[PDB]
Amino acid sequence: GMRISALQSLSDTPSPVQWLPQYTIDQAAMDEGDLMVSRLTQLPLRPDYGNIWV
């Protein structure tokens, strides 16, 4: 059960890219959602701070 189509592709880009989400009518419990995030969370870590004022 396949389709005939070559492996077209893109190249390596050394920069992070902007992203914006789209939602759907699917519904889930908020306490469940936070349970997964804490499981997948990459924290703790020390970030760079930057500048409040320039």
Binding site: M2, R3, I4, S5
Partner: protein
Amino acid sequence: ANVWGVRLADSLSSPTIETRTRQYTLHDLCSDLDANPGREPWKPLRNQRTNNIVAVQLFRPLQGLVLDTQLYGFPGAFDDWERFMREKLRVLKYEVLRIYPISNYSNEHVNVFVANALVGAFLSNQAFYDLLPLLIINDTMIGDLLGTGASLSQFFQSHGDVLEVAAGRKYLQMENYSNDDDDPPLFAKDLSDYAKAFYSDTYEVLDRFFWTHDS
């Protein structure tokens, strides 16, 4: 989608057009022996980190090196190896042209096994004069070697109606191959005798041969 540990892209694509065959003639043998332009019958392989050349890949007349490396007397460098090959092939070309006049035998085919074996024997300093009468096909590429009982076991032999041939080297390892993480993989084709080939006309005879032979 997943096959043990490897992932698949969920779409298919295969080649649809195929080229044609081309016979191997005496003129093309001479031209390959010439190696004057960048038409040399070998190509270089480079390291990915230090960009230096570490091996060579071999082509039509050069695929016959089955003895150990020291017997061939190759130099460790690339440029010296290139010079050595050019010189020896130049000498062998005239030794061949001595036997076969160019205006007479221009339009005839060559026995490829014999070309590879002759080149290898010439480089290794074996008696190569026996192979020379076999350098032009007369009846059939396989049949001529089958019908000749007087040959050299260094290259090929006959088991009834099956021709056993020693598979030659594909890659030749220069001095710089340190088994690096960027050294190209040679896939065990740089060894002395990594395989054996059996040639015939019908697959039925081949499998009825491997009946008796151990697999």
